[PDB]
Amino acid sequence: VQLXXSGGGXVQXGXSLXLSCXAXXXXXXXXXXXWXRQXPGXXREXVXXXXXXXXXXXXXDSXXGRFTXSXDXXXXXXXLQXXXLXXXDXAXYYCXXXXXXXXXXXXXXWGXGTXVTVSS
Amino acid sequence: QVQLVESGGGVVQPGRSLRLSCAASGFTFSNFGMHWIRQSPGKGLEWVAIIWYDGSNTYYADSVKGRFTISRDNSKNTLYLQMNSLRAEDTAVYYCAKVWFGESEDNYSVDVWGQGTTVTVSSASTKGPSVFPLAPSSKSTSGGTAALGCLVKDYFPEPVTVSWNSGALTSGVHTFPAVLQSSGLYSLSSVVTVPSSSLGTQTYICNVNHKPSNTKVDKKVEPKSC
Amino acid sequence: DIQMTQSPSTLSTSVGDRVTITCRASQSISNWLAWYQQKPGKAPKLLIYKASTLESGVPSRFSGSGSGTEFTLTISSLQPDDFATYYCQQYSSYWTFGQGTKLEIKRTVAAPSVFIFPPSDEQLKSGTASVVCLLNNFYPREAKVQWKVDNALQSGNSQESVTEQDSKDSTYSLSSTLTLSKADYEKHKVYACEVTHQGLSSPVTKSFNRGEC
């Protein structure tokens, strides 16, 4: 199983980006997909999770109301819509598959990351 | 309004008998049919039996037929359930419920439930818990917060109460729901998070009370060196 | 015997959401279907009868629909009082309940704090060793605790307990107790609990050495 993130870049404060996480080698419809982020000098921190369609999406305090996760199961891809972006949101963003269909957070497979910089 | 008050629950050995009663008020008891319904964590909500307003017809769930008898005294406004040959799987909260007023050519169910009375079928004997400290250390310390507690193990029956420092410590206390062990005895933990800087100088004592056995146990929880 | 099934088992939801839960019968029950509400430690309460008629006093944000085998209950705009477990019941042929649908308080994700506690000397003197792993103040409810004794995964010798959602912040806490005999406990050195949760990027392990504490 391979994951690849895309959609990051340089954005102004108050701007919007949309990250994508495409999966190959395995159908991911049955798995929750999570987004994490890491900034220099800090630990990798949870951002949001899209569980299976119908099982809901859950969010970190720092992004509630501004970020929205969604799924395109037909294309084996998940998305993180990021609105009202702040300098504090600058980080590399990663997606991970929860291998546990009952959602205990067994993150075996990770993407390589996409860079997000909020400045100017 | 309508009130139903169950009584008669308790701990019973397998094969013995128990009689529940249900005192009714606020409505003309002799005009309504009545239900017994039970709830256990393993079988959910489960209808047990129905009796007619005049005591004529009675019906029972397959799982209690031949062992349970529903009856009523309309002059005393009381409903009864005699339970014989009790089994472990009969352990549940038993509720009486009033059949609602429906129109002649309709099916019916219940509108008002009592608060229930608990029936526990077990071979275990009344026993207070052993209380062991859950000692804080670097292994239960994260930053300025440390966790400590007490393990309240091998008691029967429910319930137990746990306080901390005679009630002076309530913030950050979690007392967990008991689990029934394979021995037939219950076990739980009560934990609290405290400032790490307080360990070794502030005294922390859990106070465990088990009324069925008249057990009272204070356990001082002291840190370990790891 | 008519079989009733409800979906979903748990729904994580928020004040103001429109909520619909479903109930299915294994055969036609016409519209002889009731809905009861129950909170922990409390008796059930009648909400809806004949599939769609509200009981007196039930607020207008509740409704029900269906006839035959498929039924729904809908709350148009959820309120805190509605966080509870909902049971359907057919009364077409005797009385059978669904398994219940619990409306759970949705909140933001919080990873657990993890603590481990070695057995006390008092219990060791009595011939048993209980080791406790605590996961404090986390959300959502799903987590995995794995016990490892000298890096060997344990199974069949531990039990878990989970609290109700905290009244203040709606988080969960979880206790896991590994129980061995004194001899089995003294036959090994390293005792660890490894914890996963969707809020954690990597598993969290807490461990001690027998004789270290």
Numbering used by the authors:
A (entry chain K): 2 to 121
B (entry chain H): 1 to 52, 52A, 53 to 82, 82A, 82B, 82C, 83 to 100, 100A, ...
C (entry chain L): 1 to 94, 96 to 214
Question: What does the study report here?
Answer:
Here, we characterize IGHV3-33/IGKV1-5-encoded monoclonal antibody (mAb) 850 elicited by immunization of transgenic mice with human immunoglobulin loci. mAb 850 binds repeating NANP motifs with picomolar affinity, potently inhibits Plasmodium falciparum (Pf) in vitro and, when passively administered in a mouse challenge model, reduces liver burden to a similar extent as some of the most potent anti-PfCSP mAbs yet described. PfCSP contains a largely disordered central region composed of only five amino acids (aa; asparagine, alanine, valine, aspartate and proline) arranged in a large number of repeating NANP and NANP-like motifs (NPDP and NVDP). Multiple antibodies can bind the repeating epitopes concurrently by engaging into homotypic Fab-Fab interactions, which results in the ordering of the otherwise largely disordered central repeat into a spiral. Like other IGHV3-33/IGKV1-5-encoded anti-NANP antibodies, mAb 850 primarily utilizes its HCDR3 and germline-encoded aromatic residues to recognize its core NANP motif.
